[PDB]
Design a protein around this ligand. Sequence first.
Ligand code: MG
Ligand code: MG
Ligand code: MG
Ligand code: MG
Ligand code: MG
Lengths: 233, 222, 125, 196, 196, 204, 195, 195, 226, 212
Amino acid sequence: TQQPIVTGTSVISMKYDNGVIIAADNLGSYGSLLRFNGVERLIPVGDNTVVGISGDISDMQHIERLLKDLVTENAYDNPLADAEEALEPSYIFEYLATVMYQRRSKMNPLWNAIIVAGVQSNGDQFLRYVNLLGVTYSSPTLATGFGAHMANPLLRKVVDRESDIPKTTVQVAEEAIVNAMRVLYYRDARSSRNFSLAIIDKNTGLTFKKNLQVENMKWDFAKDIKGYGTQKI
Amino acid sequence: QFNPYGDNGGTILGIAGEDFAVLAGDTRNITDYSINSRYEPKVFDCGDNIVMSANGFAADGDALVKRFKNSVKWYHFDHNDKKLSINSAARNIQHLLYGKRFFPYYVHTIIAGLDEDGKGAVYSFDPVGSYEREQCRAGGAAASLIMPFLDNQVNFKNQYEPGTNGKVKKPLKYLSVEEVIKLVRDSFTSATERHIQVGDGLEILIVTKDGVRKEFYELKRD
Amino acid sequence: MTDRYSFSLTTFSPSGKLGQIDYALTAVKQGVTSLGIKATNGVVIATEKKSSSPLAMSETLSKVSLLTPDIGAVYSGMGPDYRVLVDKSRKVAHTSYKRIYGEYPPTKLLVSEVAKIMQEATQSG
Amino acid sequence: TSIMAVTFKDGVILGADSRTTTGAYIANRVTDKLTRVHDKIWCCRSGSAADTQAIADIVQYHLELYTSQYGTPSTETAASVFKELCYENKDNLTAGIIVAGYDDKNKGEVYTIPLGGSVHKLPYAIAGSGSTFIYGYCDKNFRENMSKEETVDFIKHSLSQAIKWDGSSGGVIRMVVLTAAGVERLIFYPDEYEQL
Amino acid sequence: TSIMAVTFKDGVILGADSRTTTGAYIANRVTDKLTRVHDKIWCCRSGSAADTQAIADIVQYHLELYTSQYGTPSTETAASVFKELCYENKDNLTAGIIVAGYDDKNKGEVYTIPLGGSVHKLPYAIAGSGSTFIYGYCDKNFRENMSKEETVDFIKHSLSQAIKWDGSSGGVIRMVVLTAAGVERLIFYPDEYEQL
Amino acid sequence: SDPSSINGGIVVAMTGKDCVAIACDLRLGSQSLGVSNKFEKIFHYGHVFLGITGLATDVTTLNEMFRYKTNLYKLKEERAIEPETFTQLVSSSLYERRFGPYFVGPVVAGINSKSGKPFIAGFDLIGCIDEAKDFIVSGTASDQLFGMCESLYEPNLEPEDLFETISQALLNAADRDALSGWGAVVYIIKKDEVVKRYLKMRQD
Amino acid sequence: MDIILGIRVQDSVILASSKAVTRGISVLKDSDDKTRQLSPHTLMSFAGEAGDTVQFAEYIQANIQLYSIREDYELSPQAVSSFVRQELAKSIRSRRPYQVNVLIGGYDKKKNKPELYQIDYLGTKVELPYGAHGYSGFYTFSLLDHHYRPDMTTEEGLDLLKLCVQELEKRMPMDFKGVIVKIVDKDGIRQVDDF
Amino acid sequence: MDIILGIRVQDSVILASSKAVTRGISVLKDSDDKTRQLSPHTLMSFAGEAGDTVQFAEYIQANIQLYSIREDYELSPQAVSSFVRQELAKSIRSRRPYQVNVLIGGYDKKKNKPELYQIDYLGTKVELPYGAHGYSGFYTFSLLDHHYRPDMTTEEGLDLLKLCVQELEKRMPMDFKGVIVKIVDKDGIRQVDDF
Amino acid sequence: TTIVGVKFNNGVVIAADTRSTQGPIVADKNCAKLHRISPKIWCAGAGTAADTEAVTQLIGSNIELHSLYTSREPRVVSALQMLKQHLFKYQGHIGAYLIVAGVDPTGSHLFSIHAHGSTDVGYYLSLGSGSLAAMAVLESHWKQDLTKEEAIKLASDAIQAGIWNDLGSGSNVDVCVMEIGKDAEYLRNYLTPNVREEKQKSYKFPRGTTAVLKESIVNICDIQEE
Amino acid sequence: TTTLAFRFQGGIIVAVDSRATAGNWVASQTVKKVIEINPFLLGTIAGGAADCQFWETWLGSQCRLHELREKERISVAAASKILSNLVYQYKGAGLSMGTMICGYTRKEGPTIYYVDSDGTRLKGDIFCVGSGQTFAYGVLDSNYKWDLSVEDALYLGKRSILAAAHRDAYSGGSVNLYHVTEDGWIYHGNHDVGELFWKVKEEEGSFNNVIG
Ligand SMILES: [Mg+2]
Ligand SMILES: [Mg+2]
Ligand SMILES: [Mg+2]
Ligand SMILES: [Mg+2]
Ligand SMILES: [Mg+2]
């Protein structure tokens, strides 16, 4: 049993017609202190999977090393390591999910909420969640922390059920994700303007976008707001 | 302090027929006031004509089902591909649950299938492994909303035959699979109206001598 | 300071008359005429707006007052006494009825409350 | 919350962020923490929003009744009324208030009233959760008798840093300028101050 | 405690105050918080003195045994050993360590390791109770590829402010310069830095 | 410990076609111990009926209080109180004890004498009105009652059909609650006649 | 105090109350009468916290006696029980509540009927054919449920009461030092001196 | 369990132990023998936490019986009491201590003397002319201090023991359902079946 | 609960869901959360349901008396001031969280009030357990110079986000529109997207199914003449 | 819960209720509170259901291994002590058990051992365990005799559970009866308390307070 120290906030994600999108800001908070502004919380595994992690950053770095070690281990005595016997998103997730549940069962959890986004060998979209309790679930949209409360409602307006996935394009899906990141910047006190976004498409592969910023923000109306009730000036 | 348990909501319902059995459960998965997933399967086909669900804390629920499925696999290896009877599965699950007596699987487990005489069977477990064969059993969040209704409509409790005035009970006539599914659907529709954690979808697994069949139905998403 | 008049200023005279009440009625008699007529499908109340000066805006001085949405009042006698009675009548319709029963009082009961206030000024210290 | 008040040559300027949080949720991202108790006596509010609003409203009442009888009150008088409320009710209040005002006789004055209910007259004052991160900056960069443009830059740069590091602070930088000329409101948006 | 490490053109400089307190009593006013784990790999210590000394001693042992077998270790390697101890024993440690070192290949490098046991490579790092008060100042005044004299002034001015506001920090400002030329110790007394 | 589940018991109320029905169990207990099988929880003031679950001393106290208040109401108004008005009175009376409340779950039922409209209402311990069209539930088996009522209920039932629905809703809910049962009573209320029926049920 | 029983038979009410008074470690008395006569045909037994029990009982006694003098009339057992309930209901939301449970056995001279009322410290009143307070009912009610009849004589009621006391003396860990039994009927209140 | 007494007279040791076994609310048994024969001339009575008492007593019994067979020789009461004390002294610093108090009454065949040893759960041994555990001594010791003589007969010891039990039955709140009395002398151990 | 308020061109609109809950149990499936303080000053409440109802009735009562006393139509700032000073006095023990909106001679207004007595001004606001879902929608679609039709659409969409995504909110959408120089229009059950589907079976019992011990006529009538 | 067992001329009567509750919620009315350890031994269930089920089923396995090794029926004393020694090892861990181990052998005759999760092991003639034990004890104590017939003894056990089922809120549902003889136990059926109550009320004349 511990308490989280340096933390990462919301990770958000959704399925679209040919793959999955996942995004997370580049902030490592230290309580209310916005300590580290250059933290990458989306970690790609191969060319077909991206693991997005929130919560304790020291545990994230540990998980990051486990995944790096997993790729090395898979390549051992494996001529098809870059082909038929390459790591799948489903393999990577199940491994993490096992670790998360084992660790919670020893009363020493990895203090995280993880979303594994990827595309399988047969082109199927993979999107599944796991957290410090070892709880797992899948959905057309998935989000951690504040994202669950604010991002999901917006993303679910695009893909409300399974049948909406083939109707959703990458441009529409990316637009929804980028808007959700703006909303989280407005309303989450532990978020930053800078973020990373990753798209895993079955045709165009893994596209990893760094150094993105929240833009087209509405603040002008603030000038008109005066006082807290009766004050006119 | 770290709390290793959580509540993922959900409600499940097992009913034993004359020559069949059904195990139903909603597909909604939640934490607190948020919805994690509108479709997250909760009732599972475990092989050997047995269906299972472990409702409550989803991580422990998944762990138990996984371990039981594994137990079925190794039962085949060790005992010449012998079919695991529902009563044997039930006793095996008791030992899995009681194995963690002092750090329990925080779930209410129900399995369903057919006994060795071909009759419908449902077994119900508490978190630490006490179990019993039962005709009718709702589990989870809206269990208190469903069971009284089932006492009345399945077992005909408090119902008497008109004219006699409390002297002759209503006879316990056998229900068909179509009749049971109606009561299951109405139970979950009612539970959805009055319980916030119940909704989205209803998935029913029907077990007969022919095998395991699935049926899905929409529920209110609010 | 302190209100040291804790005794009744209205008392029975040897003849059985309550002087101050009689004299109050005399003040009402000097007051401007007001009337009320009840119809089958309504009630009407009316009075003259005796303007003290032509420079005065008689619209601001309201002799006829809404007590509840379904109850109205008019008077004859001393205007200031009326004005405070209307304020008390409006408040008592809420405090001793609407805040209890969630509805406005019936005419007779609101009248009863107003009557009680006027009775107390006839016996209190 | 990040708030400050700075005296300069022509008078005094009050500065504040616009973020109000309930835990990690931003309940209001366009809050106005610069509030008026008299024509040219304003205050910056930090701590319990309910408490500081209740206090400010009472002070405004007191100074309004003061003005009706004795004419315009001094900035010192306003600070005293704030202090009296904060000190006497210290057990039931979580309020950190900076009082700033402009007289013609005394010119720009700044008083800070922390949790305890004490009063401290200063050339400038900083307060709120975000103030911790700019004690070093403000102490190194503050000068007495600055111009209006210099003081606006000082407050803008200071609160910019406070906002950058404090998660509890953010949104727009509001400012109120108090001089003989009158009362001027200013606002500065994220795209302006973040790039500084 | 106020500690920092800053990379510059010729390498890296570690800076620290010298105050160690037991409550409000200054147990040691001339503490040396800049400690050596290898010839040109040093660290700044904050948190539990027992823990950070125990950790530093173990790291020095590890890097000494490393050197015997594999030659001079990288600054990254040293930071990794620190991290491994701090992360794996996070339940029983209260340690906040900044690791700074000079290679010829990599030049000046700075790594910070906060309570959790995470690692963060930075151009410069600040830590300790007094660091809170100079986040604003350091962010505004830091430049990459500074000269030796500029970096010494930056650290001196920064820790001067940290000491000024933090009661837990104080005494002398110790510094250690790590370059190709070698290892240079510097010290700056109250009469020097207070008047800045 | 929990005042609302020391004594136990339940009340349910339903609307029908030109009629209302209100019903209650008869149990009073001291936690596990059964004390009385004749503790009726439904009272009436004129044609307005009031069921009260919860702490038994408060059930008794509030009945005496509303008898008190409706009697004075009648003397001054020169007419019997109506269900809509009484509901507001119950709400006001509970909220005036906001920071020291009666631990009860009241249920109003009746027909407006002038309009003939069937009316039911429920309250939390503190006075918040729940004015439902279909049904109101209260007591230690309220979850069970919600489940029974939600499935069994259909609108515009005739008095003699409504009796069967509310009776079966109560009985089967009480049989799934340890602190409810030991007999039951059902009131069938029409504009100018009221029938009261005691039900036969298991006595465990 | 510990055990207080009550049983209403055909033409009378019988109250049995334990004699023991224990103050933690020692039994200070074994002849304590846990009852007060409220009026000639109304008796109240009591059990609860020390001091409160007697203080309450005597306070009620004084009030009923005051009413008897003022009106020159004896209140019905129902009226007395309602008065007592209100005092306890008033008490439970006080600064320091009376921690007292009572049984009120009375004979209504108007209706010519015996009446037994059970009231706990919360103000929970119930009219019963037989009653108890605390743990006493747990041992005795199964016997009373079995044997009780509404047309029992006073002698039969006493026999059933002896069986209840015997079961208490067997299965209760505490020694309550036997019981004092009193009968309330049309002729008034009298004590059964041999039991 | 509750009350266990012991008294060493001229030529024997008398142990009196209560018969009651209570499980919180109910008295489950009223004929329980809270003693074990360790050897032909050594008897141990016991009282303490449930389960531990009998588990401990039987464990001691087995060990003394084992010693008796191995050496074909009966250990002296002093030797047995020392062995028992060490087990309890070992127990008190264990993960879960035995919560058991014992009296060891024995007749030393070598010295031709009766011996009574009192040992509590901490391993506190004392040799006494008369002893008790728990609250039993508070009621009985004043009587034993007064009447006891080292040259008492077995019949006189029983009379003094009856007086102790009578005082317990009067002033103790708990009903311990009387006592089983056993005498340990040169001829061995026997039970006084009427008491 | 999900409640929202949205300013527009010539007025303000408030909206709310219609679910009231007892823990996880739905007590009323069509609750009315839009309360009237005065004819053209309405508010929506969240938190302790009795407190929101009680505090609006009390202030609404005092507002009416004040309106009669001053011969002026009531102002929103008066309702705001009276609410906050009352709630502040009780230090959060009165669990009322309100969104107050209305029109008056000064203009159109929108405020929020928290249980401890703090108030906020805004063009768009949301309160309740579904406030985060609702605020996400408001932050995504709100703009300056909204029309009446756009504000109703935005407000109801914000409530829907709460209805679907928040378990504490559900059933229907209530709306009230307060435009300047007009009567406020209360739109009860403006949207009804959660009607229960027809059941698979009728559970109407045969008459005489229930066992009965006794029957009797209850005397509801007064004491009779003769 | 209410469970009882008593020794008499014809062997042992075992009687239990059938109700299971989680707080106020009645989880089941059809619970089996008699564990059929083997054809000769019975065990009652009170406190923790899983603890009783698991360990008394386990006890049956140990009894089977005993008579395989020793070629002889295990004694009731030996069987009960295997269980008590086991739970005593777990003492402190939080096991919840209150059971009667009942049997009839040649050397012992009809024997009942009360076994507890505190480690208590008591031989006795009459035992009642559960939340409704006090009610059952009253009916037993007043009507019990050694020279009861098998018919009357069965009724006494049935009537005593009924007494508890009525008064105790956490007891009821139905009554399960067993009669233990030297040749093995004999099941005497499930008896719904709802139907049994009215039947007993009418035939016996008891429960006059209750309106029927
Ligand atoms: Mg919802
Ligand atoms: Mg240490
Ligand atoms: Mg210093
Ligand atoms: Mg019962
Ligand atoms: Mg064993």
